[PDB]
Design an enzyme around this catalytic site. Structure first.
Site, short mmCIF file in Angstrom:
data_model
loop_
_atom_site.label_atom_id
_atom_site.label_comp_id
_atom_site.label_asym_id
_atom_site.label_seq_id
_atom_site.Cartn_x
_atom_site.Cartn_y
_atom_site.Cartn_z
N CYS A 51 3.61 1.88 10.02
CA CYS A 51 3.57 0.61 9.16
C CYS A 51 4.76 0.07 8.41
CB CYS A 51 2.53 1.13 8.01
SG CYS A 51 0.81 1.02 8.21
N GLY A 102 2.68 6.48 10.24
CA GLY A 102 4.03 6.38 9.96
C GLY A 102 4.94 5.11 10.48
N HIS A 105 0.79 -1.42 0.01
CA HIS A 105 0.02 -0.10 0.03
C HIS A 105 0.92 1.47 0.03
CE1 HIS A 105 -0.38 -0.49 4.54
NE2 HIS A 105 0.48 0.83 4.35
C1 LIG Z 1 -0.39 2.52 7.74
C2 LIG Z 1 -1.44 2.05 8.41
C3 LIG Z 1 -2.06 3.36 9.19
O1 LIG Z 1 -1.57 3.68 10.23
C4 LIG Z 1 -3.39 3.84 8.52
C5 LIG Z 1 -3.89 2.46 8.30
O2 LIG Z 1 -4.39 1.91 9.69
C6 LIG Z 1 -2.76 1.80 7.57
C7 LIG Z 1 -3.01 2.14 6.24
C8 LIG Z 1 -3.16 3.45 5.83
C9 LIG Z 1 -2.75 4.52 7.08
C10 LIG Z 1 -3.57 5.77 6.94
C11 LIG Z 1 -5.01 5.53 7.18
O3 LIG Z 1 -5.23 5.04 8.57
C12 LIG Z 1 -4.13 4.62 9.43
O4 LIG Z 1 -4.43 4.45 10.51
C13 LIG Z 1 -3.51 6.19 9.46
O5 LIG Z 1 -2.41 6.27 10.34
C14 LIG Z 1 -2.91 6.85 7.98
C15 LIG Z 1 -3.04 8.39 7.71
C16 LIG Z 1 -2.16 8.91 8.97
C17 LIG Z 1 -4.55 8.83 8.04
C18 LIG Z 1 -2.66 8.87 6.53
C19 LIG Z 1 -3.44 8.03 5.52
C20 LIG Z 1 -3.23 6.36 5.75
O6 LIG Z 1 -4.13 6.06 4.59
#
Ligand SMILES: C[C@H]1C(=O)[C@]23[C@H](O)[C@H]1CC[C@H]2[C@@]12CO[C@]3(O)[C@@H](O)[C@@H]1C(C)(C)CC[C@@H]2O
Ligand SMILES: C[C@H]1C(=O)[C@]23[C@H](O)[C@H]1CC[C@H]2[C@@]12CO[C@]3(O)[C@@H](O)[C@@H]1C(C)(C)CC[C@@H]2O
EC number: 3.4.19.12
Lengths: 301, 301
Positions: free
Chosen positions: B145, B143, B41
């Site tokens: 992940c 950040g 992703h």
């Molecule tokens: C890497 C993981 C992660 O931490 C995600 C998900 O839980 C997962 C995938 C995507 C992010 C997140 C969408 O939700 C997240 O919880 C969030 O931390 C992310 C942001 C900060 C909102 C940025 C967009 C991002 O799409």
């Protein structure tokens, strides 16, 4: 999201851990530049530990009496001296994995990571607090002595603890890296006992802010209280008094959640008087006091 | 003595952590030999994460689209491929700090250490269990992940988890290092929810043995019970059934303390029916289920 008891990454400390052997006594040493630091009781036998005289015991020793192994490689000791309750063994070789480091003495209520080691071999890492009574509630088996506590700021390792002994109640006593004991403890296996401990009030408040930030809100109320009226309650439940500096330190967390420090104090008063009622906060059924305001900001910012 | 939630020393894993950037999306990668492993992703934007088609998204990418930094040093990517939900980026240089390692898939109920990382920079280490519902209760901010879970056996790192997403209840979902998800979760930010969780019975029993070994005895009784009559109680309190293999695995701990497994089951029955009555076990006011029989032996032997 989520909240865990989190240790610092241990790599920088792993590369400093060695084994120190004198006679049939072996424990852990810390190898920084061309010096190895270890507990001075490494020069004591089972018999001596009753009531030793370390000046007499050290004067009867020479460099060749100290075996230092950095994993496989044996380090040649070219000098020895006593600094308070630690031994400094000058060696042939400067540790090429020596990180940027400082020796800092911490205060009761502050947290640090412990790298539990056996025969100079790292076994595990966990987070501790220095108790108000200058003990720590660690996990240590025979051969864990010389294991160090530390914090990491940027790339710098602040060493704050070296493990020396276990006390009767199963709690642990040690020194800073200058060999000065935390609390009224000495390096002889005798009738010493930990003084009465208290709960670290400011840490419990910081942990309630961590709970709010992670969506645990059930313990909040419309009430507030005064610093005086709260401190009357603290005294009764064996909590440390809260000071203006404590509320100042909780300022950032107060601003982030929009709950005033004295409002959160009102919640703590109720939790102490009433209990939790089969309910939990951040996966705990009691009030946690080994997270500092810094620890919370670190994990929740 | 003492009992702590203990992580493995993280050094061997710290030296494998890198940052992977594609467009404006950045997260953590694992650098082993001349391959960097990260969540697929990383090729998705904020918009794409709704409902991506990863084959279409990857075919429109080339090597130069992937920025990999090992601290300061930038690594030249010379190949890319998708394996299930992980991306494999072949790089110029073999990681000189590559430890002996294996990719192992773990079972619900088993524990592992998590090295939480941000932009390829290790922040902290903590112990997790794989829940019966294939979620983990971690600590992860934006950040985090690509952060990995692992065990250490001798000098070998068994990688078992890579973090992918956070679920609505604030719990976490990820893959093994072959990119196969734990549980019924997918790498798109959608309406997925964790199934009903249960308590890991064998782990709670192992933890009661740890308590006995550390001098907490108050919960013991003269009563015993049958595996059938206990399992009737387990079902009612949302505990997993206990099997003959579970009692066999608890054999060594049973022998060390001299308390038969079914005797300890009688104690658990009483604790479930009556509660604790303002009393604690190993500094906890609830029954802990994230310590395996192995974890206990490791720390209490
Ligand atoms: C890497 C993981 C992660 O931490 C995600 C998900 O839980 C997962 C995938 C995507 C992010 C997140 C969408 O939700 C997240 O919880 C969030 O931390 C992310 C942001 C900060 C909102 C940025 C967009 C991002 O799409
Ligand atoms: C290194 C610390 C340590 O672990 C000590 C103390 O708590 C402290 C100093 C001495 C050991 C220990 C006496 O008590 C100990 O608790 C114990 O582990 C030691 C043995 C295994 C009985 C061997 C003799 C030894 O004297």
């Amino acid at each position: 999201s989520g909240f865990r008891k989190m240790a610092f990454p241990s790599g920088k400390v792993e590369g400093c851990m060695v084994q120190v052997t004198c006679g049939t006594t072996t424990l852990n040493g810390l190898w920084l530049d061309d010096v190895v630091y270890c507990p001075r009781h490494v020069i004591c036998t089972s018999e001596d530990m009753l009531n030793p005289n370390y000046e007499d015991l050290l004067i009867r020793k020479s460099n060749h009496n100290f075996l230092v192994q950095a994993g496989n490689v044996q380090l040649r000791v070219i000098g020895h001296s006593m600094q308070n309750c630690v031994l400094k063994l000058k060696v042939d070789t400067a540790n090429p994995k020596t990180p940027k480091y400082k020796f800092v003495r911490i205060q009761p209520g502050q947290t640090f990571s412990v790298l539990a080691c056996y025969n100079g071999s790292p076994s595990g890492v966990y987070q501790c607090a220095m108790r108000p009574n200058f003990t720590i509630k660690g996990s240590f088996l025979n051969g864990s002595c010389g294991s160090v506590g530390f914090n990491i700021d940027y790339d710098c390792v602040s060493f704050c603890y070296m493990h020396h002994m276990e006390l009767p109640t199963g709690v642990h006593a040690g020194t800073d890296l200058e060999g000065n004991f935390y609390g009224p403890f000495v390096d002889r296996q005798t009738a010493q006992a930990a003084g009465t401990d208290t709960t670290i009030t400011v840490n419990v408040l910081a942990w309630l802010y961590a709970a709010v930030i992670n969506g645990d809100r059930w313990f909040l109320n419309r009430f507030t209280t005064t610093l005086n009226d709260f401190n009357l309650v603290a005294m009764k439940y064996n909590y440390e008094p809260l000071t203006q500096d404590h509320v100042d330190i909780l300022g950032p967390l107060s601003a982030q959640t929009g709950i005033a420090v004295l409002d959160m104090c009102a919640s703590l008063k109720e939790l102490l008087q009433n209990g939790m009622n089969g309910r939990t906060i951040l996966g705990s059924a009691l009030l946690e006091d080994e997270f500092t305001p810094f620890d919370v900001v670190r994990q929740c910012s």
